[PDB]
Design a protein around this ligand. Structure first.
Ligand code: DD8
Length: 802
């Protein structure tokens, strides 16, 4: 009756929030309760007119390469209604001024040109100008905002030393327990139990007295229990709870097994109980509830020493002297926003006094607030190394400066960063709740970015599910309708992918596929595309649908577009795959999209193709089909072969000369990008190219060479084992490489988090690849040398690949 809505949300999320069986406290229920207010606040504050039409706009400057297309200076936008007419408009002209009521929707898209924004500052206008396409719009009627209607004793006096009683470890099928007090990645104090023979049950009943006191336990503290026999099981328990109270009583904790990592920081217990390892522990209880309460300059030499510490890379660890230097002169270090991550590492979190000294130091934020926004440091303070609620919130406060365009560039990386938050309700989760609820595009990607983890991560599904339910409860009836239509389709397409895979390691398979898709089309008739929400896919082209030939078996699906106002009847091609982890490809594609923005600021377009890719469920998702594209393997199935393929598929010579240029930029782009990320040693079948000349890597799901610059690519430029194109390539390569190096800290910390949340020494790769330390001229030469490593090898490495 009154519960029907929750069972609808339950099916959208893919996990039950009301079901509380793997919970030892009430944090999820308390954060479900606490999340109501920032949803109520956002639902109410959003302009219902601009919420319904979600104009995807930017406040960033129009790039160098895009002002080349505009001349007079005017742009042509063709308005449709059967009868169409072109209108010459100034780049700085508002959409209403063009209209001279009615709205300017994009043809075949739920994309609109609205608000007090210049047309040059629209993401669809910039997109068309980049791709050299016409701006086809339609004089449509604004959508009803009615469709989005939303349904409605003190701690610092407990000077006693802390202790935990290790009762034992009950397991269904030598060993010792390692008890740790943790804050960030920094272990405060360790204690082990005496080794005992490994059996079905191992009792100890011994108390482990720690060096740290109750008073000195920081908000965010963790009792991390580990089972060593060398590490085999782990579990965590927040010593300070959500209601600021120290943990008391008996706790049985089901432990996570093994095979550093974000999964190893989780406060959640293992849901499996009949097969998992447990741990009975006792925590000292009291009659009254224990509750946590709330100059000189610097000499020229010690200034230079501190300046060198700030200027180093994030991965560079601080010594004991570096930590003392930074802490003593914290008031100076506070006047340099770049020192904050390193300074907040230098503080002794296991000392109530040193913590209180930081908390009051942070009240002098006049300098941090007034600073120019840096995503680098903001992401730095949100990682595993920072467990303090206050420090993290200073980073979340800067995320408010980010306009909807930028929130989209880091939505996935911010969603992952929630894994490092000690408590469920956090400034970050709330931040992602505001931005998702304010914007429909952000909200759509939020849904899928959260649903990605809820369905595959047993470690963080609990936390993420309460954040999804909170977003869902405020998006409005329209988005809730759209998501049911997406869930219903992917859940339908999930069975088909799995049933077909359970028939192969042919005509039988291809007939059985259409035999199943037939009893599927007879709901829904339309659904938004999870990786491109503007595009609405209609009914299937069941005759075009096939099962793909590789080691894995994906579903090549083609859907007609639901919008009849579309320019072409070109179907929407979607790959539905199983057995591969799309969570890592999502992460790689995101850094690629970030790299492009870095190049945009530096006035460069390296023509990357970061194809839509959404992780949907348990090792299953969907991938965008790139139209008129094939792999290098299919083009070979040597030197001449690619340039012969480009001319052959090219209509005019004008278009071919465009095809070789689109090749040099995209090739240089994938050369710099895949090198930095360390995914350049890839097989020919994992490198694609459009009939337009647009090259792009794929299958990112986890002798040597730095990148792929084979002779067939070189022959396209006009070189065999210099050229006017190869010189243009080398120059744009360096120009692109040096741009990414200006954002070292950003890339370093983006990669670091990517590793921990998606997948110590492995991370160190970007230090060397982004040539940390070396000057602008030394890096130019270093990259040009890596070009020559590909020239020397040629077909060697490509041949080596089995
Ligand atoms: C025409 N055509 C293909 O043949 N294929 C492939 C199918 C699987 O064998 C490799 C080639 C693709 C595409 C494959 C991906 C992709 C698939 C899995 C992982 N990462 C990326 C993306 C876009 C694509 N577009 C077009 C297209």
């Amino acid at each position: 009756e009154s519960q029907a809505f929750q069972r609808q949300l339950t099916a959208l999320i893919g996990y039950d929030v009301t079901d509380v069986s793997n919970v030892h406290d009430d944090e999820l229920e308390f954060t479900r309760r606490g999340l109501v207010t920032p949803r109520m606040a956002e639902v109410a504050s959003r302009d219902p007119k601009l919420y319904a039409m979600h104009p995807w706009v930017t406040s960033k400057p129009l790039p160098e390469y895009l002002w080349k297309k505009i001349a007079n200076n005017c742009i042509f936008i063709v308005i449709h209604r059967t009868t169409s007419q072109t209108i010459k408009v100034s780049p700085d002209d508002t959409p209403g001024a063009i209209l001279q009521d009615f709205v300017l929707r994009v043809c075949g898209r739920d994309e609109y040109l609205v608000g007090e924004t210049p047309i040059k500052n629209f993401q669809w206008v910039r997109h068309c100008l980049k791709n050299g396409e016409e701006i086809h719009v339609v004089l449509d009627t604004p959508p009803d905002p009615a469709l989005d209607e939303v349904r409605k004793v003190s701690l610092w006096d407990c000077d006693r030393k802390f202790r935990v009683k290790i009762r034992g470890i009950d397991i269904p099928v030598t060993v010792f327990v390692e008890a740790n007090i943790q804050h960030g990645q920094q272990v405060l104090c360790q204690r082990r139990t005496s080794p005992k023979p490994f059996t079905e049950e191992v009792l100890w009943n011994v108390w482990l007295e720690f060096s740290i006191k109750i008073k000195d336990l920081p908000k965010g503290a963790l009792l991390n229990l580990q089972i060593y026999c060398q590490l085999l099981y782990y579990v965590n328990l927040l010593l300070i709870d959500h209601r600021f109270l120290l943990r008391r009583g008996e706790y049985v904790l089901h432990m996570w097994q093994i095979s550093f990592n974000a999964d190893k920081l989780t406060s959640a217990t293992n849901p499996d109980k009949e097969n998992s390892m447990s741990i009975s522990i006792l925590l000292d209880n009291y009659c009254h509830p224990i509750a946590l309460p709330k100059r000189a300059e610097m000499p020229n030499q010690l200034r230079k020493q501190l300046e060198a510490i700030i200027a180093t890379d994030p991965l560079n660890p601080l010594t004991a002297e570096d930590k003392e230097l930074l802490w003593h002169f914290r008031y100076e270090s506070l006047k340099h926003p770049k020192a904050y991550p390193k300074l907040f590492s230098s503080v002794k979190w296991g000392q109530q006094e040193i913590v209180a000294k930081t908390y009051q130091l942070l009240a002098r934020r006049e300098v941090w607030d007034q600073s120019a926004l840096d995503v680098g440091l903001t992401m730095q303070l949100l990682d595993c190394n920072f467990s303090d609620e206050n420090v993290r919130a200073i980073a979340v406060q800067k995320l408010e400066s980010l306009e909807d365009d930028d929130v989209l560039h880091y939505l996935l990386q911010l969603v992952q960063a929630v894994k490092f938050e000690p408590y469920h309700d956090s400034a970050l989760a709330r931040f992602l709740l505001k931005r998702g609820l304010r914007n429909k595009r952000i909200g759509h990607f939020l849904f899928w970015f959260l649903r990605s983890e809820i369905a595959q991560s047993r470690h963080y599904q609990q936390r993420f599910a309460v954040i999804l339910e909170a977003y869902l409860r405020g998006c409005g009836t329209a988005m809730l309708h759209d998501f049911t239509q997406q869930v219903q389709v992917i859940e339908m397409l999930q069975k088909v992918t799995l049933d077909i895979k359970s028939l192969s390691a042919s005509s039988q398979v291809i007939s059985q596929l259409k035999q199943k898709l037939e009893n599927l089309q007879n709901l829904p008739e339309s659904f938004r595309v999870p990786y491109d929400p503007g595009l609405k896919a209609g009914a299937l082209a069941i005759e075009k649908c096939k099962v793909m030939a590789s080691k894995k078996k994906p579903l090549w699906l083609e859907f007609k577009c639901a919008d009849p106002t579309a320019l072409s009847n070109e179907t929407i091609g979607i790959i539905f795959k199983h057995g591969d982890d799309l969570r890592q490809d999502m992460l790689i594609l995101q850094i690629l999209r970030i790299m492009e923005s870095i190049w945009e600021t530096e006035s460069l377009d390296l023509c990357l193709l970061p194809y839509g890719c959404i992780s949907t469920g348990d090792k299953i998702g969907m991938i965008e089909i790139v139209k008129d594209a094939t792999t290098i393997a299919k083009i070979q199935q040597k030197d001449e072969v690619l340039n012969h393929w480009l001319k052959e598929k090219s209509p005019t010579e004008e278009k071919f000369q465009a095809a070789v240029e689109r090749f040099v930029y995209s090739c240089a782009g994938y050369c710099v990008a895949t090198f930095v990320l360390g995914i350049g040693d890839r097989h020919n079948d994992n490198i694609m190219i459009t009939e337009t000349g647009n090259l792009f890597h794929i299958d990112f799901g986890h002798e040597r060479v730095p990148f792929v610059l084979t002779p067939d690519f070189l022959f396209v430029m006009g070189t065999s084992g210099t050229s006017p194109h190869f010189q243009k390539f080398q120059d744009i390569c360096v120009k692109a490489y040096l741009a990414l190096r200006h954002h070292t800290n950003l890339l370093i910390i983006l990669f670091s988090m990517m590793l921990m949340t998606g997948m110590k020494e492995d991370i160190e790769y970007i230090r060397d690849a982004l040539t940390v330390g070396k000057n602008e001229e030394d890096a130019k030469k270093y990259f040009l040398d890596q070009i020559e490593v590909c020239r020397d090898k040629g077909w060697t490495v490509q041949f080596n690949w089995f």
